Each structure stands twice: as structure tokens, then as C-alpha cells.
Amino acid sequence: FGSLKDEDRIFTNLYGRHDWRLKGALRRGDWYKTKEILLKGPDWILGEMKTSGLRGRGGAGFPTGLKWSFMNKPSDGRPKYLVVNADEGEPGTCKDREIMRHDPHKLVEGCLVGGRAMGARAAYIYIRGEFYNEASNLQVAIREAYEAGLIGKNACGSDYDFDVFVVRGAGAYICGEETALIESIEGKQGKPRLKPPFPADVGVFGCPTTVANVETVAVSPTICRRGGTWFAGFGRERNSGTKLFNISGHVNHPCTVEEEMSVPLKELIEKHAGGVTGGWDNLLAVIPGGSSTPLIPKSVCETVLMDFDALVQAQTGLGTAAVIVMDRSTDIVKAIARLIEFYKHESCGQCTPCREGVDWMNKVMARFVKGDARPAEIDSLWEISKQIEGHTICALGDGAAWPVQGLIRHFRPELEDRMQRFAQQH
Amino acid sequence: FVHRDTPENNPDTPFDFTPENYKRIEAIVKNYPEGHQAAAVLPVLDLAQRQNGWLPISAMNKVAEVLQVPPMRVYEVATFYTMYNRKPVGKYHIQVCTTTPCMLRDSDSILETLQRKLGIKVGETTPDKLFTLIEVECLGACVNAPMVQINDNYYEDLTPKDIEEIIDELKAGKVPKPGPRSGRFCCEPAGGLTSLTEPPKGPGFGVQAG
């Protein structure tokens, strides 16, 4: 039912409005119970997230507590590590750009609060290189914090030691991937690894490591402060907590609001943000989680609401919860076509199914926009799509297939007409 | 992806980190774990790019040298990332975001305007070497869709005219107020701040017990 209270809204400094710097942060009281929390114990911190039942705030959804629990196993003589990926290459994820730029501190204490939960020696934050200015803001914030002694050895007047670092991204969406963020951190080409050696087991520099969406690291200190329950209540069943929602494209006032999860899709454009540009009936389709997730057409949308369980029922993913909206004024065949162009210019090429498959769909999709291709080719792309969905080394091939599948699933008649249109003029 | 040695772009172009740069280079090295320098190739390669936009084959060889890694190792890193430029870069190097979010909100619109203003095709440097236009992909900051990153400036929410204004500012003078040149602050509902219009609770507000 959304409509979270401003007080409950974790990221108050969102939109700025309060000095993003430490003195603004102190008025925010972000560093209020940090010593106590760490003192309580690592086990106490994970109890808090397990009670919260928080799901991954990045595109993949998994219990946050269980993921952190995995490298809570005893150290084998290799320093455990924390990796925070501030890269958000996915379209519509200006979600993270806020916390980093507007409220850098929340993430800094998120890092050490999270750090003792996994007993990480240190945390590296991979902010996308594109955001150079953004980087300027966080290390100013990180510098403040150590000057204070909030972070560093004996951080926050406690036995525990932590050091936080910022790493430059270099314009790659794939760098975002969990195994590939590491390799970029390692300095090799940004190519994902296979999951069998899991990230905790083989870490960066062969030292156990864990990767979290910046939102996931940022909420952990406030969730421990507010307790898992407070946070647990807002969510729906497995779904829980407020997740920032970004609405971009064909809406009167595109904005990122951290309104509550489980929001009716019709409600968030209509009540907050801006009602769909041109009217709620001028909605050819909604992209709920960003480019990777399949778009849902208008009749399905208001019925469904934004929570991961509800979306998977709907065949779409909450993902980064980036709402991209397409009025009846858009050539979807070309809209999704550029997302496949978005993925041919970006997939690493390490795996055969994504390399040739994504390029193959790009060529077919460009012909589809022209209408040159015949109607039988449309289900051909269906079959090419699932070959790439289950065979890829990483999830990006998973992601490339879904928008193609969505276009065929709900807009098959329109593509046939574009097929028909070209055949008629000869 | 092949460096055919050319008089301009080839090692005859000597490269060496400024005494100041070399300093920076090490700062990078210790940020990474001890015994680990290879991990710094990217950050370093970035400072070679900071030094000079061209970053020729000579510059990458130096990077590998300073970082004591297989030279190819540096060559592979430079080729994989779009951030690095292996060819000369225009002083301004504007990049226009053309992913669906920006296109839906008119990103394409901007392009046509910029091509005419720079009076040049998309993808190459102006004869003046003044600006270089490229159709880059999602640069983040989608809520503000019309967008054109210029050396990190990241101007946002721009209407075609705005850019022309910006370009002129760049063409005569400098620092043209980089950022979203529309009333909204950072990302904010154009209407206002529905999310939080109240004052923020202070330190230790409703902090749960335990």
C-alpha cells in the first residue's frame, strides 16, 4: 500500500536538502548507534537483516542476509573483503546515483556496519568512471569520516578494523556483474567468471569477497538502528522494505522517490512522480525493473504492483525497480531494438551464446523496425531468445533475451503489421 | 582493434608520468592490496589518459612498464573499456546518451541540434579539434534524460536549445555551469519533494531498542 512516512524513508538526504557532508549527516544522525551495533556482535547484525528479510536491491533478488551469512564462515587465513558496486549501467538506475552523490555518508557507515557483519578487512567501492564528479563527493565524505575516526583501524572507538576505498569504473555495464566487478578490481579485463567457484569462496585476490548493490549496503545501518521488524513490516511477505523507484520517460514529472514497495503500478505514476504523460490510457507499456526486465503492457500493469514476488507472477522482474514508461507515441519495435543495440555494444563476448546471439537479435530487430523481415522470422527470434537465456555464462544474456521475449509476448500483432506494411509498398 | 604504427600514434611519441603524475601513480598502488600492483593498471591507464587523451601505443607500454605487467595485459584493458581513447580526443569530447530512456524522452532530438551547431558528423572531431561528438550509451542519470556528458560535466535535462547555449559557452569562455540546466535540483520530482517535504528527523530518531 506504499505511502511510506517521511520518517520511515531511509534516505532522507535524497534530493540533497540536507548537507550531504558530515555536519549535515550528523543532523541526520546517520552515525548514531554505530559503536553499539558493532559491539553487539556480527551475529547480532545478521540477525537484524534475517529478521528484515531484505531482498537484493540490485537487479538480482536474493535474501540479503543469507548472502552475507555465506562468508561469515571462519577465515582460512585470507583476508575477507567487501565490494560495493556503485556502477549502475542499467538504464533508469539513477537510483544509486543519489545515495552516492546526495548521501555519501549513509553508504560509508553502511560499509562498516556491513563490514563487521561479514568481518571484512576492507571495502572497495566501484563507482562507474562515468561519474567522476560523483567520486569527488564520496572520498570527500570518506576523508571526513576517517578524520573523525569513524572509519580506519579501531573504527568508531571499537576493536574492529575497516578501510574503505573507491575504484574507478571505465564505462562498462558488465563491470557491474558480481564476478566481473571483481576482475576489474583485480585489474584484468572485465569478463565474468563461472559461478562454480562462488564469489565468497574465491574472492578478489583469492580472498573471500561479497558484492552488494550500494542501496543494499546503505540501508543495513538504518535497518539495524530501526530493527528488522520496522523494516520488515513495510514489505509484503518475502518482499519487504522501501526500495527507491525511478520513473523515467513519458511521465509528467520523472523523479526517483523512495516510496514504499508493493505499490500499485498505476498508483506510483498517478500519485507521486508524474501521471503518465498524455494520460494513463496513453501507456503502450511499462518497463518495471529497467532494460533487463521484460516490459508489461497497460492492461496487466495497474492490476500488478511493484514487488519482486508480484512481478515474477507477472513474468517480469523488479530488478533495479527503474520504471521506464512508453506512451502510445513510441515505436516499441525500435525502443526495444536500441536496448538490443545497448547490449551488442556492451556484452563482453566471453561466451558464445551472448556474443553471436545478441548480435543476431540486433540484426533481426533492426530489420523488424524497418518491417523488411517476414512474419515467420518473429517466432524464429523467440527461439533464438531462449537459446541465449539458459546458456549464458552470466546474466546479461539472460537480460538481453527478456525484452525480446516481452515484445513478441504482448506486441506480436504490431510487429506483424510492420511486417505487412513493407510487403504492401514493395 | 589493431595498432598499425603511425608516425603520430606510435612509440616515437615518448610517454612518461610527470614527476607529479608518478606520485599519483603510487598512491594508486598502495590503495590496492600489498603485493598487488597489477590491479592498478586501469586506474593508472586512466592517469595516462588524464595526462594525454590520445594515450598512444607508447603510453600503454609505459603503463605496463610502471606496473610491471605483460604489455598485452594493458593493451587488453585499454581495448575493452570505452572510457580509454586510443585515438586523439577533442578538447571537449561531448558524448550524447541515446539509450531508449533518453530517446523516449527525446535524446535523439538533442543529437540533430548538436551535429548542426558543431557543423560536423557524429563520431569525429571538429576541424577546430574544439569538440568531438560521439553517440555513447546509457551514462546514468536517466531521470534527467536529455543528456550530454562533456568531460564529466554531465549536463542534464537539456532541451535542444540549451545545448547550443552550452556549446557556445564552451566555444567562447569556459565552465558553462555544468549540470541540469532546468529548475529541478539533482533528481527531484519537477513538482517538488513528495518523498520528504517535512524536516528530517535528527540523530537517534526512533532508534530501535536492543
Binding site: R121, Y146, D163 | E34
Partner: peptide
Amino acid sequence: LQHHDYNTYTFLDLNLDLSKFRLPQP
């Protein structure tokens, strides 16, 4: 307007400044 103006070396040089704070290496 700190965001409004920063130099190309802000990130790196700021970091070097932070080096002193940076905890000892592994």
C-alpha cells in the same frame, strides 16, 4: 556548489591525501 567544480585529479589526489589514513596493507 562543490559538485559544480572539481579538477581532473580530484579523485586521485584526494585519494593520495587519504593514503595516510588508509589502514596498513594486507
